[PDB]
Amino acid sequence: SVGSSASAWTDVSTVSSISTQTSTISRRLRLKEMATQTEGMNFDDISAAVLKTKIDRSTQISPNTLPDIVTEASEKFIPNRAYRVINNDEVFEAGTDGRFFAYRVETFDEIPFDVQKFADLVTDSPVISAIIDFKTLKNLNDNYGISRQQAFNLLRSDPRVLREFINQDNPIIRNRIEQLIMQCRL
Amino acid sequence: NGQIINTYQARFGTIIARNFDTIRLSFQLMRPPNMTPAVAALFPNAQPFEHHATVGLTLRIESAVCESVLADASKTMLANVTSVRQEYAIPVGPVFPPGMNWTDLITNYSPSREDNLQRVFTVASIRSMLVK
Amino acid sequence: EYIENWNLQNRRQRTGFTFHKPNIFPYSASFTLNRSQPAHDNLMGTMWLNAGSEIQVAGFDYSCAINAPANIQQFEHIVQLRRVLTTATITLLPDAERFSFPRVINSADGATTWYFNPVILRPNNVEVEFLLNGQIINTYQARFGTIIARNFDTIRLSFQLMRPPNMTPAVAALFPNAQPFEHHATVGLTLRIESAVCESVLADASKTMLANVTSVRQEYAIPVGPVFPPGMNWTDLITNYSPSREDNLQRVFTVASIRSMLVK
Amino acid sequence: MDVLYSLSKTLKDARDKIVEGTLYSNVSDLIQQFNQMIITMNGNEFQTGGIGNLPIRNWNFDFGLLGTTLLNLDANYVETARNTIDYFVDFVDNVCMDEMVRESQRNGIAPQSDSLRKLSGIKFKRINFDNSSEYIENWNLQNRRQRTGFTFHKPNIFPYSASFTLNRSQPAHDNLMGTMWLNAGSEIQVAGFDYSCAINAPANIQQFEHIVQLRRVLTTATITLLPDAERFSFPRVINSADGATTWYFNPVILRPNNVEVEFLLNGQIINTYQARFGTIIARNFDTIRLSFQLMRPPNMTPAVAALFPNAQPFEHHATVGLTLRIESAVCESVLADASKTMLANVTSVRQEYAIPVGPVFPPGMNWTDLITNYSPSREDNLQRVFTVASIRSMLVK
Amino acid sequence: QNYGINLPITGSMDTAYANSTQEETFLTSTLCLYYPTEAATEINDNSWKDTLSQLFLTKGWPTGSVYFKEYTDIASFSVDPQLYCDYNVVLMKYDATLQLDMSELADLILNEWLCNPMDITLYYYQQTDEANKWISMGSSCTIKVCPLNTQTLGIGCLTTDTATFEEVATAEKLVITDVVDGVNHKLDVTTATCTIRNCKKLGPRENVAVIQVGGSDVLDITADPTTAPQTERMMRINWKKWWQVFYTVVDYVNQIIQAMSKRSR
Amino acid sequence: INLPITGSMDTAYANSTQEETFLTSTLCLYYPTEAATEINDNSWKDTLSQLFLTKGWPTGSVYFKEYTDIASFSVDPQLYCDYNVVLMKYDATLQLDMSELADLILNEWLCNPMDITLYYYQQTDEANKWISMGSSCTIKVCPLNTQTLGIGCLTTDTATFEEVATAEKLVITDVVDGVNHKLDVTTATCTIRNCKKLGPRENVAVIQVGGSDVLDITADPTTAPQTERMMRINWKKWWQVFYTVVDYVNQIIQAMSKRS
Ligand SMILES: *[C@@H]1O[C@H](CO)[C@@H](O)[C@H](O)[C@H]1NC(C)=O
Ligand SMILES: *[C@@H]1O[C@H](CO)[C@@H](O)[C@H](O)[C@H]1NC(C)=O
Ligand SMILES: [Ca+2]
Ligand SMILES: [Ca+2]
Ligand SMILES: [Ca+2]
Ligand SMILES: [Ca+2]
Ligand SMILES: [Ca+2]
Ligand SMILES: [Ca+2]
The DSSP secondary structure of F173-208, one letter per residue, reads E---TTS-EEEE--TTTEEEEEEEEEEE-TTEEEEE
F126 alpha carbon – ligand 5 mean position (Å) = 51
CA distance E141 to E134: 12
Rg (CA), chain F: 22
Give the separation between CA B19 and CA A109, rounded to whole angstroms. 14
Q: Are F141 and F182 in contact (CB under 8 A)?
A: yes
Q: What is the DSSP string of C119-184?
A: EEE--EEEEEEEEETTEEEEEEES--EEEEEEEEEEEEEEEEEE--SS--HHHHTTS-SSS--SSE
Q: How far apart are CA C144 and CA D163, in angstroms?
A: 13
Q: How far apart are CA F30 and CA F205, in angstroms?
A: 10
Distance CA D56, CA D58 (A): 7
Buried b (16+ CB within 10 A) or exposed e, A27-48: ebbbebbeeeebebbbbbebbe
Give the containing element (helix H, strand E) for A137: helix A134-143
- E7 — phi, psi (to 5°)? -110, 145
Q: Where would I find the beta strands (DSSP E) of chain C?
A: 17-20, 25-35, 44-52, 54-61, 72-94, 103-106, 113-116, 118-121, 124-132, 135-141, 145-162, 184-198
Contact B97 C135 (CB under 8 A): yes
Determine the distance separating the centroid of ligand 5 and the alpha carbon of E122, expressed in angstroms. 21
Q: How far apart are CA D370 and CA D361, in angstroms?
A: 7
Distances in Å between the Cα of C171 and the Cα atoms of C61, C184, C193, F255 are: 16, 12, 35, 9
In 3D space, the residue among E97, E152, E147, E107 whose CA is nearest the CA of residue E127 turns out to be E147
- Put simply, whether D163 touches F (Cβ < 8 Å) is yes
Closest alpha carbon to E248 in E20, E50, E71, E240: E240
- Measured CA to CA in angstroms, residue F87 lies from D231, F83, F213 at distances of 43, 14, 14
Q: Which ligand is closest to the CA of F40, given by its number?
A: 5
**Which residue, A122, A37, A42, is CA-closest to A81?**
A42
Chains F and B are touching, with contact defined as 3 or more CB–CB pairs separated by less than 8 Å:
no
Distances in whole angstroms, Cα of residue D139 to Cα of each of D290, D381, E93:
35, 12, 88
CA-derived radius of gyration, chain E: 22
- In angstroms, rounded to a whole number, what is the distance separating the alpha carbons of residues A98 and A94? 7
Exposure b/e, B64-92, CB count within 10 A at least 16 = b: eeeeebeeeeeeebbebbbeebeeeeeee
The helix/strand/coil state of C2 is helix
Judging by beta carbons within 10 Å of its beta carbon (0-12, 13-18, 19+), is residue F258 exposed, middle or buried? Answer: middle
- As a whole number of angstroms, the distance between CA E91 and CA E114 comes to 25
Q: According to DSSP H, which parts of chain D are helical?
A: 2-17, 28-41, 75-99, 115-119, 134-143, 302-305, 342-353, 367-371, 376-393
Known binding residues of B for Ca(2+) are 1, 21
Look at residue F247 and give its three-state secondary structure: helix
- For ligand 1, atom 11, the nearest C-alpha belongs to E19
Is D250 within 8 Å of D235 (Cβ atoms)? yes
Indicate the burial class of E24 (C-beta count within 10 angstroms; 0-12, 13-18, 19 or more).
Answer: exposed
Task: List CB contacts (< 8 A) between C160 and chain F.
Answer: none
User: Cβ(D345)–Cβ(C87) under 8 Å?
Assistant: yes
Residue window 32-91, chain C: list those with CB within 8 Å of chain A: none
Secondary structure (DSSP) of A151-169 = HHHHHTT-HHHHHHHHHTT
Residue B51 per-residue DSSP state: S
Residue of B1, B6, B9, B12 for testing the chain A interface, max A β-carbons within 10 Å: B9
Residues of D in contact with F127 (CB under 8 A): 311
Give the gap in angstroms from C-alpha F251 to the nearest C-alpha of chain D. 15
Rounded Cα distance between D205 and D194, Å, is 10
Query: How many Å apart are CA D93 and CA D98, to the nearest integer?
Result: 9
- Cα dihedral D260, D261, D266, D268, rounded to 10, equals -50
**DSSP secondary-structure letter at D353?**
H
Angle of the D75-99 helix axis to the D28-41 helix axis, nearest 10? 60
Q: Report helix, strand or coil for D280.
A: strand
Choosing from E20, E21, E23, E59 the residue with most ligand 1 atoms within 8 A of its CB, the one to mutate for a pocket test is E20
β-partners of residue E199 are: E115, E133
- Cβ contacts below 8 Å, chain C against chain F, sum to 37
Contacts 24+ apart (CB under 8 A), D121-124: D123/D40, D124/D3, D124/D40
Contact between D324 and D223 under an 8 Å Cβ cutoff? The reply is yes
Residue nearest to ligand 1 atom 1, measured at CA: E19
Contacts of C160 (CB under 8 A, 6+ apart): C72, C73, C74, C75, C123, C124, C125, C126, C187
Ligand 1 nearest-atom number relative to CA E22: 5
Ligand nearest to the CA of E201: 4
- CA dist B44 and B50 (Å) reads 10
Name the residue facing E147 among F51, F213, F244 (closest C-beta).
F51
Alpha helices of D227-375 — where are they, by DSSP H? 302-305, 342-353, 367-371
Exposed e or buried b per residue across E179-208, where buried means at least 16 C-beta atoms within 10 angstroms of its C-beta: bbbebebbbebebeebebebbebeebbbbb
Alpha-carbon span A30 to A127, nearest angstrom: 10
User: What is the resolution of the experimental data for this entry, in Å?
Assistant: 3.4
Using CA atoms of D140, D142, D147, D153 in order, give the dihedral in degrees to the nearest 10: 80
**Residues in a beta bridge with D206:** D294
Determination approach: cryo-EM
Q: Which residue of E has its CA nearest to A14?
A: E18
The amino acid at residue D318 is A
Pairing of strands A127-129, C54-61: unpaired
Binding-site positions of C read 20, 133, 153
Residue type, C249: L
Q: How many CB atoms lie under 10 A from the CB of residue D369?
A: 16
Secondary structure of chain F: what % helix, strand, coil (to 5)? 25, 25, 50
Please, are residues E108 and E179 in contact by the beta-carbon 8 Å criterion? Answer: no
Distance E106 CA to ligand 3 centre (A): 11
Q: How many residues does chain A have?
A: 186
Q: Could you list the beta-strand ranges (E) of chain D.
A: 45-48, 57-60, 150-153, 158-168, 177-185, 187-194, 205-227, 236-239, 246-249, 251-254, 257-265, 268-274, 278-295, 317-331
**Could you give the dihedral angle defined by the CA atoms of residues E181, E184, E186 and E189, in that order, rounded to the nearest 10 degrees?**
30
SS3 D251: strand
Kindly provide the b/e burial profile for residues F58-96, where b requires at least 16 CB atoms within 10 angstroms of the residue's own CB: eeebbebeebeebbebbeebeeebbbbbbbbbbeeebee
Q: Which residues of C touch F206 (CB under 8 A)?
A: none
Which residue, D189, D217, D235, D226, is CA-closest to D374? D217
Instruction: Report every protein residue that has its C-beta within 5 angstroms of ion ligand 5.
Output: E 156-157, 164; F 41
Q: Are strands D45-48 and C124-132 parallel, antiparallel or unpaired?
A: unpaired
HSE, CB side, 13 Å, CA atoms: give it for residue D260: 11
Q: Label residue F239 exposed, middle or buried (CB < 10 Å: 0-12, 13-18, 19+).
A: buried
Nearest CA, atom 12, ligand 1: E19
Q: How far is the CA of F214 from the centre of ligand 3 (A)?
A: 24
| CA atoms within a 13 Å half-sphere pointing along the CA-CB vector of F146 | 0
Q: Which of A176, A16, A26 is nearest to A97 (CA)?
A: A26
The dihedral over CA atoms of B93, B99, B101, B104, expressed in degrees to the nearest 10, equals -40
Helix (H) or strand (E) holding E250: helix E243-251
How many CB atoms sit inside 10 A of residue E129's CB?
12
- Ligand having the closest approach to the CA of F20: 2
Q: Which residues in chain B are contacts of C133 at CB distance < 8 A?
A: 108, 110, 113
Burial string for C83-107 (b: 16+ CB within 10 Å, else e) reads bbbbbbbbbbbbbbbbbbeeeebbb
Quote the longest CA-to-CA distance of chain D.
95
Cα–Cα distance measured from residue C152 to residue C131, given in angstroms and rounded to the nearest whole number: 5
- Residues near A139 by Cβ (< 8 Å), separated by ≥ 6? A172, B7, B9
Q: Are D310 and C111 in contact (CB under 8 A)?
A: no
At C79, give phi and psi (nearest 5°). -120, 135
Spatial separation of the C-alpha atoms in residues C74 and A144, rounded to whole Å: 58
One-letter amino acid at E104 equals E
- d(C-alpha C95, C-alpha D230), whole Å: 11
C39 vs A22: CA distance, rounded Å: 30
How many angstroms is it from F50 CA to the middle of ligand 5?
Answer: 13
Interface of A with B (CB under 8 A): 110, 135, 138-139, 142, 172, 175
C172 touches chain F (CB under 8 A): yes
- Give the number of C-alpha atoms closer than 13 A to the C-alpha of residue D173, restricted to the C-beta side: 24
Apex E30 CA angle, E27 and E35, nearest 5: 135
> CA-CA distance, C191 to C143, in Å (whole number)?
12
Chains E and A touch each other (3 or more Cβ pairs < 8 A) = yes
Ligand nearest to the CA of E18: 1
Distances (CA, A) of D331 to C50, C95, D67, D219, D286: 34, 31, 45, 6, 11
